[PDB]
Amino acid sequence: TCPEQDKYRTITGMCNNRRSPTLGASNRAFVRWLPAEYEDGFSLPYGWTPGVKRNGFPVALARAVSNEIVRFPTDQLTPDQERSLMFMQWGQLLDHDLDFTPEPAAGVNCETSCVQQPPCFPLKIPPNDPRIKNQADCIPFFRSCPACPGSNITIRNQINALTSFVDASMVYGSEEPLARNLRNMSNQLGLLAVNQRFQDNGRALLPFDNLHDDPCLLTNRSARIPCFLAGDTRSSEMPELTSMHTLLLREHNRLATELKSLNPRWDGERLYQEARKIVGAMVQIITYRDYLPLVLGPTAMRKYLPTYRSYNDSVDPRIANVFTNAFRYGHTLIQPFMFRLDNRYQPMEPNPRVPLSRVFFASWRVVLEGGIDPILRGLMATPAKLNRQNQIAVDEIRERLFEQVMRIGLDLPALNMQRSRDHGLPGYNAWRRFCGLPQPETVGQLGTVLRNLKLARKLMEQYGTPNNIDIWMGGVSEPLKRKGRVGPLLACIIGTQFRKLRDGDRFWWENEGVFSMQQRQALAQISLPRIICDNTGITTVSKNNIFMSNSYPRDFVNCSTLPALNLASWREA
Protein backbone atom coordinates (compact mmCIF):
# COMPACT_ATOMS: atom_id res chain seq x y z
CA THR A 1 0.00 0.00 0.00
CA CYS A 2 1.64 3.26 -1.28
CA PRO A 3 0.76 6.94 -0.74
CA GLU A 4 -0.05 9.09 -3.77
CA GLN A 5 1.92 12.01 -2.35
CA ASP A 6 5.44 11.55 -1.01
CA LYS A 7 8.34 13.99 -1.19
CA TYR A 8 11.24 11.71 -0.31
CA ARG A 9 12.45 8.19 -0.99
CA THR A 10 11.75 5.56 1.58
CA ILE A 11 14.81 4.14 3.27
CA THR A 12 14.07 0.61 1.94
CA GLY A 13 13.28 1.72 -1.64
CA MET A 14 9.73 0.44 -1.20
CA CYS A 15 7.14 2.40 -3.18
CA ASN A 16 9.62 3.95 -5.61
CA ASN A 17 7.69 2.37 -8.49
CA ARG A 18 4.03 2.77 -7.58
CA ARG A 19 2.49 -0.04 -9.66
CA SER A 20 5.28 -2.49 -8.63
CA PRO A 21 6.24 -1.33 -5.16
CA THR A 22 8.88 -3.96 -4.29
CA LEU A 23 11.13 -3.20 -7.30
CA GLY A 24 14.49 -2.00 -6.05
CA ALA A 25 13.43 -2.32 -2.45
CA SER A 26 16.00 -4.03 -0.21
CA ASN A 27 16.03 -7.69 0.94
CA ARG A 28 14.40 -9.07 -2.21
CA ALA A 29 15.75 -11.46 -4.80
CA PHE A 30 18.00 -10.32 -7.60
CA VAL A 31 16.40 -10.36 -11.01
CA ARG A 32 17.68 -12.89 -13.53
CA TRP A 33 18.42 -11.58 -16.98
CA LEU A 34 19.15 -15.17 -17.98
CA PRO A 35 18.05 -18.43 -16.36
CA ALA A 36 20.17 -19.96 -13.66
CA GLU A 37 22.58 -22.75 -14.61
CA TYR A 38 23.13 -25.19 -11.77
CA GLU A 39 24.79 -28.60 -11.81
CA ASP A 40 21.56 -30.36 -10.77
CA GLY A 41 19.22 -27.94 -12.55
CA PHE A 42 18.11 -25.91 -9.51
CA SER A 43 20.54 -25.45 -6.59
CA LEU A 44 23.93 -27.12 -6.66
CA PRO A 45 26.75 -25.10 -8.26
CA TYR A 46 28.85 -26.42 -11.08
CA GLY A 47 31.95 -27.89 -9.45
CA TRP A 48 30.04 -29.35 -6.51
CA THR A 49 30.11 -33.09 -7.29
CA PRO A 50 33.61 -34.46 -8.10
CA GLY A 51 33.66 -35.69 -11.68
CA VAL A 52 30.42 -34.07 -12.87
CA LYS A 53 31.04 -31.99 -15.97
CA ARG A 54 29.59 -28.81 -17.40
CA ASN A 55 28.57 -29.07 -21.07
CA GLY A 56 30.77 -32.15 -21.45
CA PHE A 57 33.94 -30.65 -19.94
CA PRO A 58 35.56 -30.76 -16.50
CA VAL A 59 34.96 -27.81 -14.22
CA ALA A 60 38.23 -25.91 -13.83
CA LEU A 61 39.08 -25.09 -10.23
CA ALA A 62 38.72 -21.36 -9.67
CA ARG A 63 42.06 -21.27 -7.89
CA ALA A 64 43.75 -22.95 -10.84
CA VAL A 65 42.24 -20.39 -13.21
CA SER A 66 43.52 -17.68 -10.88
CA ASN A 67 46.99 -19.26 -10.81
CA GLU A 68 47.36 -19.77 -14.59
CA ILE A 69 45.64 -16.68 -16.01
CA VAL A 70 45.36 -13.98 -13.36
CA ARG A 71 48.72 -14.27 -11.61
CA PHE A 72 51.47 -11.98 -12.85
CA PRO A 73 54.78 -10.50 -11.59
CA THR A 74 54.02 -7.47 -9.42
CA ASP A 75 57.29 -6.01 -10.72
CA GLN A 76 55.53 -5.28 -13.98
CA LEU A 77 52.40 -3.46 -12.84
CA THR A 78 51.44 -0.82 -15.43
CA PRO A 79 50.08 2.53 -14.19
CA ASP A 80 47.09 3.89 -16.05
CA GLN A 81 48.20 7.36 -17.13
CA GLU A 82 44.57 8.44 -17.71
CA ARG A 83 42.94 7.25 -14.43
CA SER A 84 43.38 8.13 -10.77
CA LEU A 85 43.07 5.59 -7.98
CA MET A 86 39.96 7.62 -7.11
CA PHE A 87 38.45 6.00 -10.22
CA MET A 88 38.87 2.62 -8.52
CA GLN A 89 37.54 3.96 -5.25
CA TRP A 90 34.40 5.57 -6.58
CA GLY A 91 33.65 2.24 -8.25
CA GLN A 92 33.74 0.34 -4.99
CA LEU A 93 31.80 3.01 -3.13
CA LEU A 94 29.18 2.91 -5.86
CA ASP A 95 28.90 -0.88 -5.80
CA HIS A 96 28.08 -0.57 -2.12
CA ASP A 97 25.13 1.69 -2.98
CA LEU A 98 23.77 -0.95 -5.40
CA ASP A 99 24.26 -4.50 -4.07
CA PHE A 100 25.24 -6.64 -1.12
CA THR A 101 24.67 -10.41 -1.17
CA PRO A 102 24.21 -11.85 2.32
CA GLU A 103 25.72 -15.12 3.40
CA PRO A 104 25.54 -17.08 6.67
CA ALA A 105 27.96 -16.61 9.58
CA ALA A 106 30.44 -19.10 11.04
CA GLY A 107 27.29 -28.70 11.59
CA VAL A 108 30.65 -27.69 10.05
CA ASN A 109 32.27 -24.25 10.21
CA CYS A 110 33.14 -23.18 6.68
CA GLU A 111 35.90 -20.92 8.08
CA THR A 112 37.99 -23.69 9.68
CA SER A 113 36.83 -26.82 7.89
CA CYS A 114 37.43 -28.01 4.35
CA VAL A 115 34.46 -30.39 4.28
CA GLN A 116 32.03 -29.59 1.46
CA GLN A 117 28.64 -29.52 3.25
CA PRO A 118 25.97 -26.75 2.92
CA PRO A 119 26.51 -23.71 3.22
CA CYS A 120 30.23 -24.32 2.59
CA PHE A 121 31.53 -24.48 -0.98
CA PRO A 122 35.30 -24.35 -0.34
CA LEU A 123 37.75 -23.76 -3.17
CA LYS A 124 39.96 -26.77 -3.63
CA ILE A 125 43.69 -26.32 -4.18
CA PRO A 126 45.34 -27.24 -7.51
CA PRO A 127 48.57 -29.27 -7.51
CA ASN A 128 51.78 -27.21 -7.30
CA ASP A 129 50.06 -24.15 -5.95
CA PRO A 130 52.52 -21.25 -5.53
CA ARG A 131 51.31 -20.59 -2.01
CA ILE A 132 49.18 -23.34 -0.48
CA LYS A 133 51.52 -26.35 -0.28
CA ASN A 134 49.03 -28.59 1.53
CA GLN A 135 46.72 -29.61 -1.34
CA ALA A 136 44.27 -30.90 1.27
CA ASP A 137 43.77 -27.34 2.47
CA CYS A 138 41.23 -24.99 0.95
CA ILE A 139 40.22 -21.37 0.63
CA PRO A 140 36.99 -20.95 2.69
CA PHE A 141 33.79 -19.91 0.93
CA PHE A 142 30.21 -19.48 2.20
CA ARG A 143 27.37 -19.84 -0.32
CA SER A 144 25.11 -16.81 -0.64
CA CYS A 145 21.88 -17.09 1.32
CA PRO A 146 18.97 -18.45 -0.79
CA ALA A 147 16.00 -16.16 -1.45
CA CYS A 148 13.42 -18.93 -0.77
CA PRO A 149 15.32 -20.91 1.95
CA GLY A 150 14.56 -24.61 2.48
CA SER A 151 12.95 -25.40 -0.89
CA ASN A 152 13.72 -27.69 -3.86
CA ILE A 153 10.42 -27.13 -5.69
CA THR A 154 12.17 -23.92 -6.96
CA ILE A 155 15.33 -22.64 -8.56
CA ARG A 156 17.80 -21.02 -6.15
CA ASN A 157 18.23 -17.28 -6.22
CA GLN A 158 20.16 -14.86 -4.06
CA ILE A 159 19.16 -11.74 -2.12
CA ASN A 160 20.16 -8.10 -2.49
CA ALA A 161 20.18 -6.60 0.98
CA LEU A 162 20.47 -3.07 -0.49
CA THR A 163 18.32 -0.60 -2.41
CA SER A 164 19.26 -0.93 -6.04
CA PHE A 165 18.63 2.76 -6.67
CA VAL A 166 21.56 5.17 -6.80
CA ASP A 167 20.24 6.88 -3.66
CA ALA A 168 23.27 7.22 -1.33
CA SER A 169 22.12 4.14 0.65
CA MET A 170 25.73 3.50 1.60
CA VAL A 171 25.44 6.72 3.67
CA TYR A 172 21.91 6.44 5.09
CA GLY A 173 21.22 2.71 5.30
CA SER A 174 18.78 0.45 3.51
CA GLU A 175 16.65 -0.71 6.47
CA GLU A 176 14.87 1.63 8.90
CA PRO A 177 16.49 0.48 12.23
CA LEU A 178 20.01 1.05 10.91
CA ALA A 179 18.95 4.34 9.29
CA ARG A 180 17.81 5.63 12.69
CA ASN A 181 21.05 4.39 14.32
CA LEU A 182 23.00 6.56 11.88
CA ARG A 183 21.15 9.76 12.76
CA ASN A 184 21.93 12.29 15.45
CA MET A 185 18.97 12.06 17.74
CA SER A 186 20.41 14.48 20.37
CA ASN A 187 18.72 17.38 18.57
CA GLN A 188 16.46 18.74 15.81
CA LEU A 189 19.28 19.64 13.41
CA GLY A 190 18.90 16.70 10.98
CA LEU A 191 22.45 15.38 11.33
CA LEU A 192 24.18 12.07 10.91
CA ALA A 193 25.78 10.81 14.10
CA VAL A 194 29.54 11.37 14.37
CA ASN A 195 32.25 9.73 16.44
CA GLN A 196 32.18 10.99 20.05
CA ARG A 197 35.68 9.85 21.11
CA PHE A 198 37.89 10.85 18.14
CA GLN A 199 38.21 13.64 15.61
CA ASP A 200 40.34 14.25 12.50
CA ASN A 201 41.85 17.72 13.06
CA GLY A 202 38.55 18.79 14.51
CA ARG A 203 36.44 17.26 11.69
CA ALA A 204 33.92 14.45 12.10
CA LEU A 205 34.71 10.76 11.92
CA LEU A 206 32.22 7.93 11.54
CA PRO A 207 30.79 6.44 14.74
CA PHE A 208 32.02 3.07 15.93
CA ASP A 209 30.20 -0.19 15.41
CA ASN A 210 29.76 -2.82 18.10
CA LEU A 211 30.90 -6.28 17.00
CA HIS A 212 31.62 -9.18 19.34
CA ASP A 213 34.58 -10.49 17.29
CA ASP A 214 35.45 -7.18 15.70
CA PRO A 215 37.88 -7.62 12.79
CA CYS A 216 39.35 -4.11 12.83
CA LEU A 217 40.77 -4.89 16.25
CA LEU A 218 42.67 -7.93 15.06
CA THR A 219 44.57 -5.77 12.55
CA ASN A 220 46.22 -3.89 15.43
CA ARG A 221 45.47 -5.45 18.77
CA SER A 222 47.18 -2.73 20.86
CA ALA A 223 45.50 0.24 19.13
CA ARG A 224 42.01 -1.05 20.08
CA ILE A 225 40.15 0.92 17.34
CA PRO A 226 36.94 -0.90 16.35
CA CYS A 227 35.28 -0.85 12.94
CA PHE A 228 33.26 2.19 11.83
CA LEU A 229 29.49 2.34 11.26
CA ALA A 230 28.02 3.58 7.99
CA GLY A 231 25.03 3.04 5.70
CA ASP A 232 26.75 -0.01 4.23
CA THR A 233 28.33 -2.60 6.52
CA ARG A 234 31.64 -2.82 4.56
CA SER A 235 32.82 0.73 5.24
CA SER A 236 35.94 -0.29 7.23
CA GLU A 237 37.07 -2.93 4.73
CA MET A 238 39.78 -0.52 3.59
CA PRO A 239 40.76 2.96 4.73
CA GLU A 240 40.30 4.45 1.26
CA LEU A 241 36.67 3.33 1.37
CA THR A 242 36.36 4.56 4.96
CA SER A 243 37.58 7.96 3.74
CA MET A 244 34.82 8.17 1.13
CA HIS A 245 32.09 7.30 3.62
CA THR A 246 33.63 9.80 6.05
CA LEU A 247 33.66 12.42 3.31
CA LEU A 248 29.96 12.01 2.48
CA LEU A 249 28.92 11.98 6.12
CA ARG A 250 30.56 15.39 6.60
CA GLU A 251 28.97 16.76 3.43
CA HIS A 252 25.59 15.65 4.71
CA ASN A 253 26.07 17.50 7.98
CA ARG A 254 27.53 20.52 6.14
CA LEU A 255 24.41 20.76 3.94
CA ALA A 256 21.96 20.25 6.78
CA THR A 257 23.79 23.05 8.63
CA GLU A 258 23.49 25.51 5.72
CA LEU A 259 19.85 24.55 5.16
CA LYS A 260 18.92 25.36 8.79
CA SER A 261 20.49 28.82 8.44
CA LEU A 262 18.32 29.32 5.32
CA ASN A 263 15.15 27.81 6.77
CA PRO A 264 15.32 28.31 10.54
CA ARG A 265 11.76 26.94 11.05
CA TRP A 266 12.54 23.53 9.46
CA ASP A 267 12.44 20.58 11.84
CA GLY A 268 15.08 17.87 12.03
CA GLU A 269 13.24 15.45 9.74
CA ARG A 270 12.83 17.99 6.92
CA LEU A 271 16.52 18.93 7.24
CA TYR A 272 17.69 15.30 7.18
CA GLN A 273 15.50 14.50 4.15
CA GLU A 274 16.53 17.57 2.18
CA ALA A 275 20.24 17.01 2.82
CA ARG A 276 19.86 13.29 2.10
CA LYS A 277 18.18 14.25 -1.14
CA ILE A 278 21.06 16.48 -2.26
CA VAL A 279 23.71 13.87 -1.34
CA GLY A 280 21.73 11.35 -3.41
CA ALA A 281 21.67 13.69 -6.39
CA MET A 282 25.41 14.25 -6.04
CA VAL A 283 26.15 10.51 -6.17
CA GLN A 284 23.94 10.30 -9.28
CA ILE A 285 25.68 13.22 -11.02
CA ILE A 286 29.28 12.21 -10.29
CA THR A 287 28.42 8.64 -11.33
CA TYR A 288 26.66 9.39 -14.63
CA ARG A 289 28.38 12.62 -15.63
CA ASP A 290 31.98 11.83 -14.53
CA TYR A 291 32.45 8.12 -13.69
CA LEU A 292 30.43 5.97 -16.13
CA PRO A 293 31.75 7.69 -19.32
CA LEU A 294 35.31 6.74 -18.34
CA VAL A 295 34.21 3.15 -17.64
CA LEU A 296 32.26 2.53 -20.85
CA GLY A 297 34.03 4.89 -23.22
CA PRO A 298 32.03 7.08 -25.64
CA THR A 299 30.69 4.50 -28.13
CA ALA A 300 29.24 2.19 -25.49
CA MET A 301 28.12 5.20 -23.44
CA ARG A 302 25.99 6.49 -26.32
CA LYS A 303 24.72 3.01 -27.21
CA TYR A 304 23.70 1.81 -23.71
CA LEU A 305 23.13 5.16 -21.91
CA PRO A 306 21.23 7.34 -24.37
CA THR A 307 20.13 10.71 -23.12
CA TYR A 308 17.52 10.79 -20.39
CA ARG A 309 13.93 11.38 -21.55
CA SER A 310 11.97 10.71 -18.33
CA TYR A 311 10.84 8.29 -15.70
CA ASN A 312 9.45 5.05 -17.13
CA ASP A 313 7.53 3.00 -14.59
CA SER A 314 7.74 -0.10 -16.83
CA VAL A 315 11.53 -0.35 -16.44
CA ASP A 316 12.71 -2.85 -13.85
CA PRO A 317 15.29 -1.16 -11.58
CA ARG A 318 16.39 -4.36 -9.79
CA ILE A 319 20.04 -5.32 -9.87
CA ALA A 320 20.65 -8.37 -12.03
CA ASN A 321 22.41 -11.34 -10.44
CA VAL A 322 25.02 -11.12 -13.23
CA PHE A 323 25.81 -7.47 -12.43
CA THR A 324 27.06 -8.29 -8.90
CA ASN A 325 29.78 -10.33 -10.63
CA ALA A 326 30.48 -8.18 -13.70
CA PHE A 327 30.83 -4.92 -11.81
CA ARG A 328 33.78 -6.60 -9.90
CA TYR A 329 35.75 -5.57 -13.00
CA GLY A 330 37.38 -2.91 -10.81
CA HIS A 331 39.50 -5.49 -8.96
CA THR A 332 41.74 -5.15 -12.03
CA LEU A 333 42.28 -1.45 -11.10
CA ILE A 334 43.67 -2.14 -7.63
CA GLN A 335 47.21 -0.97 -6.82
CA PRO A 336 49.02 -3.14 -4.22
CA PHE A 337 49.61 -0.18 -1.84
CA MET A 338 47.68 2.51 -0.08
CA PHE A 339 49.38 5.83 -0.81
CA ARG A 340 49.26 8.71 1.65
CA LEU A 341 50.50 12.17 0.63
CA ASP A 342 51.10 15.25 2.80
CA ASN A 343 49.92 18.85 2.26
CA ARG A 344 52.54 19.30 -0.47
CA TYR A 345 51.56 16.01 -2.15
CA GLN A 346 54.79 14.32 -1.04
CA PRO A 347 55.12 10.84 0.51
CA MET A 348 53.96 10.98 4.13
CA GLU A 349 56.43 9.44 6.58
CA PRO A 350 57.07 6.98 8.24
CA ASN A 351 55.01 4.67 5.90
CA PRO A 352 53.75 6.33 2.68
CA ARG A 353 53.12 3.00 0.88
CA VAL A 354 51.38 0.37 3.01
CA PRO A 355 50.81 -3.03 1.34
CA LEU A 356 47.10 -3.67 0.98
CA SER A 357 47.38 -6.89 2.98
CA ARG A 358 47.98 -4.72 6.10
CA VAL A 359 45.19 -2.16 5.56
CA PHE A 360 42.18 -4.46 5.26
CA PHE A 361 39.92 -3.60 8.20
CA ALA A 362 42.57 -1.25 9.62
CA SER A 363 40.40 1.50 10.97
CA TRP A 364 43.17 2.39 13.39
CA ARG A 365 45.12 3.91 10.48
CA VAL A 366 42.49 6.62 9.99
CA VAL A 367 42.24 7.47 13.70
CA LEU A 368 45.96 7.32 14.56
CA GLU A 369 47.95 7.84 11.35
CA GLY A 370 46.53 11.16 10.20
CA GLY A 371 42.84 11.22 9.28
CA ILE A 372 41.43 11.06 5.75
CA ASP A 373 43.35 13.91 4.04
CA PRO A 374 46.55 11.94 3.25
CA ILE A 375 44.42 9.05 1.98
CA LEU A 376 42.32 11.34 -0.20
CA ARG A 377 45.43 13.00 -1.68
CA GLY A 378 46.87 9.59 -2.46
CA LEU A 379 43.67 8.72 -4.32
CA MET A 380 43.72 11.93 -6.41
CA ALA A 381 47.45 11.87 -7.28
CA THR A 382 48.24 8.20 -7.69
CA PRO A 383 47.41 6.40 -10.94
CA ALA A 384 45.14 3.39 -10.94
CA LYS A 385 46.51 0.08 -12.13
CA LEU A 386 45.79 -0.61 -15.77
CA ASN A 387 44.05 -3.81 -16.77
CA ARG A 388 46.11 -5.76 -19.29
CA GLN A 389 45.62 -9.27 -20.59
CA ASN A 390 48.82 -10.51 -18.91
CA GLN A 391 48.52 -8.29 -15.77
CA ILE A 392 44.93 -8.82 -14.65
CA ALA A 393 44.99 -8.59 -10.82
CA VAL A 394 47.65 -8.12 -8.15
CA ASP A 395 48.80 -10.62 -5.54
CA GLU A 396 47.86 -8.40 -2.58
CA ILE A 397 44.24 -9.46 -3.38
CA ARG A 398 45.01 -12.79 -5.16
CA GLU A 399 47.21 -14.23 -2.34
CA ARG A 400 46.75 -12.08 0.77
CA LEU A 401 43.15 -10.86 0.91
CA PHE A 402 42.14 -10.42 4.56
CA GLU A 403 45.41 -12.09 5.69
CA GLN A 404 45.45 -10.28 9.05
CA VAL A 405 41.93 -11.26 10.09
CA MET A 406 41.65 -14.80 8.89
CA ARG A 407 43.28 -18.21 9.13
CA ILE A 408 44.41 -18.03 5.50
CA GLY A 409 44.76 -15.39 2.81
CA LEU A 410 41.92 -15.39 0.32
CA ASP A 411 42.12 -15.18 -3.47
CA LEU A 412 39.68 -12.50 -4.58
CA PRO A 413 39.73 -13.32 -8.32
CA ALA A 414 39.15 -17.00 -7.48
CA LEU A 415 36.29 -16.04 -5.18
CA ASN A 416 34.65 -14.13 -8.04
CA MET A 417 34.54 -17.26 -10.17
CA GLN A 418 33.41 -19.48 -7.32
CA ARG A 419 30.75 -16.87 -6.55
CA SER A 420 29.46 -16.86 -10.11
CA ARG A 421 29.06 -20.65 -9.83
CA ASP A 422 27.39 -20.36 -6.41
CA HIS A 423 24.95 -18.00 -8.13
CA GLY A 424 24.26 -20.29 -11.08
CA LEU A 425 25.43 -17.66 -13.53
CA PRO A 426 25.67 -18.90 -17.11
CA GLY A 427 29.02 -18.73 -18.79
CA TYR A 428 30.78 -16.43 -21.15
CA ASN A 429 29.06 -17.29 -24.43
CA ALA A 430 25.55 -17.15 -23.07
CA TRP A 431 26.17 -13.55 -21.89
CA ARG A 432 27.76 -12.78 -25.26
CA ARG A 433 24.52 -13.92 -26.91
CA PHE A 434 22.41 -11.89 -24.47
CA CYS A 435 24.49 -8.87 -25.47
CA GLY A 436 24.10 -9.64 -29.20
CA LEU A 437 27.80 -10.37 -29.77
CA PRO A 438 29.69 -13.18 -31.56
CA GLN A 439 29.98 -16.41 -29.56
CA PRO A 440 33.43 -17.99 -30.22
CA GLU A 441 33.34 -21.79 -30.19
CA THR A 442 37.01 -22.51 -31.04
CA VAL A 443 40.42 -21.30 -29.91
CA GLY A 444 41.02 -19.39 -33.15
CA GLN A 445 37.72 -17.57 -32.86
CA LEU A 446 38.46 -16.80 -29.20
CA GLY A 447 41.94 -15.45 -29.99
CA THR A 448 40.25 -13.03 -32.41
CA VAL A 449 37.60 -11.84 -29.93
CA LEU A 450 40.46 -11.07 -27.52
CA ARG A 451 43.11 -10.01 -30.06
CA ASN A 452 45.37 -12.32 -28.08
CA LEU A 453 45.88 -15.91 -29.15
CA LYS A 454 48.22 -16.47 -26.22
CA LEU A 455 45.41 -15.80 -23.75
CA ALA A 456 42.91 -17.77 -25.83
CA ARG A 457 45.05 -20.89 -25.39
CA LYS A 458 45.23 -20.46 -21.60
CA LEU A 459 41.46 -20.10 -21.39
CA MET A 460 40.76 -23.19 -23.55
CA GLU A 461 43.23 -25.24 -21.48
CA GLN A 462 41.50 -24.34 -18.18
CA TYR A 463 37.90 -24.36 -19.34
CA GLY A 464 37.73 -26.70 -22.35
CA THR A 465 35.31 -24.45 -24.26
CA PRO A 466 34.49 -20.73 -24.27
CA ASN A 467 30.97 -21.74 -23.22
CA ASN A 468 32.38 -22.56 -19.75
CA ILE A 469 34.42 -19.39 -19.08
CA ASP A 470 33.17 -17.71 -15.92
CA ILE A 471 31.56 -14.34 -16.59
CA TRP A 472 34.06 -12.29 -14.55
CA MET A 473 37.14 -14.00 -16.01
CA GLY A 474 35.88 -13.67 -19.58
CA GLY A 475 34.70 -10.11 -19.02
CA VAL A 476 37.99 -8.78 -17.71
CA SER A 477 39.90 -10.79 -20.35
CA GLU A 478 38.38 -8.78 -23.23
CA PRO A 479 40.47 -5.92 -24.68
CA LEU A 480 39.38 -2.48 -23.55
CA LYS A 481 36.99 -0.15 -25.39
CA ARG A 482 38.52 3.08 -26.66
CA LYS A 483 38.74 5.69 -23.87
CA GLY A 484 37.11 3.09 -21.58
CA ARG A 485 38.18 0.50 -19.04
CA VAL A 486 36.10 -2.56 -19.93
CA GLY A 487 35.53 -4.58 -23.06
CA PRO A 488 32.28 -4.99 -24.97
CA LEU A 489 30.76 -7.72 -22.84
CA LEU A 490 31.00 -5.82 -19.54
CA ALA A 491 30.22 -2.51 -21.26
CA CYS A 492 26.91 -4.03 -22.24
CA ILE A 493 26.07 -5.54 -18.84
CA ILE A 494 27.21 -2.48 -16.90
CA GLY A 495 25.63 0.08 -19.24
CA THR A 496 22.34 -1.77 -19.36
CA GLN A 497 22.12 -1.95 -15.58
CA PHE A 498 22.87 1.76 -15.16
CA ARG A 499 20.35 2.69 -17.84
CA LYS A 500 17.68 0.77 -15.96
CA LEU A 501 18.64 2.34 -12.61
CA ARG A 502 18.26 5.85 -14.09
CA ASP A 503 15.15 5.35 -16.24
CA GLY A 504 13.40 3.21 -13.62
CA ASP A 505 14.03 5.62 -10.71
CA ARG A 506 11.07 7.83 -9.91
CA PHE A 507 13.39 10.06 -7.84
CA TRP A 508 16.13 10.48 -10.41
CA TRP A 509 17.28 14.07 -10.00
CA GLU A 510 16.38 15.18 -13.55
CA ASN A 511 12.84 13.77 -13.34
CA GLU A 512 10.17 16.46 -13.43
CA GLY A 513 8.89 17.11 -9.90
CA VAL A 514 11.94 15.90 -7.97
CA PHE A 515 13.87 19.18 -7.90
CA SER A 516 12.79 22.62 -9.05
CA MET A 517 14.23 24.03 -12.24
CA GLN A 518 16.47 26.31 -10.18
CA GLN A 519 17.70 23.46 -7.99
CA ARG A 520 18.74 21.39 -11.07
CA GLN A 521 20.69 24.36 -12.37
CA ALA A 522 22.51 24.66 -9.05
CA LEU A 523 23.22 20.87 -8.75
CA ALA A 524 24.92 20.85 -12.16
CA GLN A 525 27.81 22.78 -10.53
CA ILE A 526 28.74 20.08 -8.00
CA SER A 527 31.91 18.05 -8.38
CA LEU A 528 33.80 15.62 -6.20
CA PRO A 529 36.76 18.05 -6.07
CA ARG A 530 34.54 20.72 -4.51
CA ILE A 531 33.10 18.22 -2.02
CA ILE A 532 36.67 17.47 -0.95
CA CYS A 533 37.41 21.20 -0.49
CA ASP A 534 34.30 21.79 1.64
CA ASN A 535 34.88 19.00 4.17
CA THR A 536 38.66 18.52 4.62
CA GLY A 537 41.85 20.54 5.15
CA ILE A 538 42.83 20.01 1.48
CA THR A 539 43.17 23.24 -0.48
CA THR A 540 44.60 21.81 -3.72
CA VAL A 541 42.52 19.24 -5.62
CA SER A 542 42.30 17.37 -8.92
CA LYS A 543 40.76 19.35 -11.75
CA ASN A 544 37.75 17.87 -13.51
CA ASN A 545 37.66 15.06 -14.39
CA ILE A 546 38.79 13.89 -10.94
CA PHE A 547 38.80 10.34 -12.29
CA MET A 548 41.21 11.22 -15.16
CA SER A 549 43.59 13.64 -13.35
CA ASN A 550 46.30 11.73 -11.50
CA SER A 551 49.60 13.70 -11.49
CA TYR A 552 50.71 16.50 -9.17
CA PRO A 553 51.11 19.48 -9.88
CA ARG A 554 50.07 19.12 -13.53
CA ASP A 555 46.46 18.04 -12.92
CA PHE A 556 45.61 20.14 -9.83
CA VAL A 557 44.12 23.55 -8.92
CA ASN A 558 43.56 25.65 -5.79
CA CYS A 559 40.17 25.18 -4.11
CA SER A 560 39.42 28.92 -4.38
CA THR A 561 38.91 28.52 -8.16
CA LEU A 562 35.96 26.12 -7.79
CA PRO A 563 32.47 27.57 -7.27
CA ALA A 564 30.44 26.08 -4.43
CA LEU A 565 26.98 24.66 -4.51
CA ASN A 566 24.53 27.54 -4.24
CA LEU A 567 21.65 26.53 -1.91
CA ALA A 568 19.63 29.75 -2.48
CA SER A 569 16.75 27.96 -4.29
CA TRP A 570 16.19 25.72 -1.25
CA ARG A 571 15.02 28.79 0.72
CA GLU A 572 11.33 28.32 1.50
CA ALA A 573 8.94 31.12 0.58
Binding site: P102, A105, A106, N195, Q196, H212, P215
Partner: protein, 70 residues
Protein backbone atom coordinates in the same frame (compact mmCIF):
# COMPACT_ATOMS: atom_id res chain seq x y z
CA UNK B 1 20.08 -9.17 11.66
CA UNK B 2 23.67 -10.55 11.59
CA UNK B 3 25.34 -9.69 8.29
CA UNK B 4 28.55 -11.42 7.32
CA UNK B 5 30.83 -11.67 4.26
CA UNK B 6 33.65 -14.22 3.87
CA UNK B 7 33.26 -15.49 7.44
CA UNK B 8 33.66 -12.00 8.97
CA UNK B 9 30.67 -10.54 10.82
CA UNK B 10 30.28 -6.96 9.63
CA UNK B 11 27.22 -5.88 11.65
CA UNK B 12 24.87 -7.24 14.30
CA UNK B 13 21.63 -5.25 14.43
CA UNK B 14 20.85 -6.65 17.89
CA UNK B 15 23.90 -5.06 19.57
CA UNK B 16 23.65 -1.63 21.11
CA UNK B 17 25.76 1.14 19.67
CA UNK B 18 28.01 3.28 21.78
CA UNK B 19 26.89 6.73 20.74
CA UNK B 20 23.31 5.66 21.57
CA UNK B 21 24.19 4.84 25.17
CA UNK B 22 24.97 8.56 25.45
CA UNK B 23 21.33 9.40 24.73
CA UNK B 24 20.73 8.22 28.32
CA UNK B 25 22.37 11.44 29.50
CA UNK B 26 19.31 13.21 28.12
CA UNK B 27 16.81 10.90 29.78
CA UNK B 28 18.42 11.38 33.21
CA UNK B 29 18.99 15.09 32.84
CA UNK B 30 16.14 16.76 34.78
CA UNK B 31 16.64 20.00 32.82
CA UNK B 32 16.85 18.46 29.35
CA UNK B 33 15.01 19.82 26.34
CA UNK B 34 11.60 18.27 27.04
CA UNK B 35 10.80 17.78 23.34
CA UNK B 36 14.05 15.88 22.73
CA UNK B 37 13.68 13.90 25.95
CA UNK B 38 10.32 12.59 24.71
CA UNK B 39 11.62 11.56 21.28
CA UNK B 40 14.41 9.49 22.89
CA UNK B 41 11.97 7.76 25.25
CA UNK B 42 9.79 6.90 22.24
CA UNK B 43 12.83 5.62 20.33
CA UNK B 44 13.94 3.37 23.18
CA UNK B 45 10.36 2.24 23.96
CA UNK B 46 10.18 1.09 20.30
CA UNK B 47 13.07 -1.32 20.86
CA UNK B 48 11.57 -2.90 23.97
CA UNK B 49 13.91 -0.93 26.22
CA UNK B 50 11.36 0.82 28.38
CA UNK B 51 13.39 1.94 31.43
CA UNK B 52 16.77 3.64 31.71
CA UNK B 53 17.85 0.57 33.66
CA UNK B 54 16.85 -1.70 30.78
CA UNK B 55 18.93 0.45 28.43
CA UNK B 56 21.99 0.27 30.71
CA UNK B 57 21.64 -3.47 31.33
CA UNK B 58 21.51 -4.17 27.58
CA UNK B 59 24.52 -1.94 26.92
CA UNK B 60 26.61 -3.70 29.58
CA UNK B 61 25.42 -7.09 28.28
CA UNK B 62 26.64 -5.99 24.81
CA UNK B 63 30.18 -5.04 25.89
CA UNK B 64 29.79 -1.29 26.39
CA UNK B 65 31.23 0.76 29.26
CA UNK B 66 28.26 1.46 31.54
CA UNK B 67 30.20 3.22 34.23
CA UNK B 68 28.76 6.69 34.59
CA UNK B 69 25.43 4.78 35.22
CA UNK B 70 26.02 3.23 38.71
Amino acid sequence: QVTSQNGIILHDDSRMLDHELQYVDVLINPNANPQTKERLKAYFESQGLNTVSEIVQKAKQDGLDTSKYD
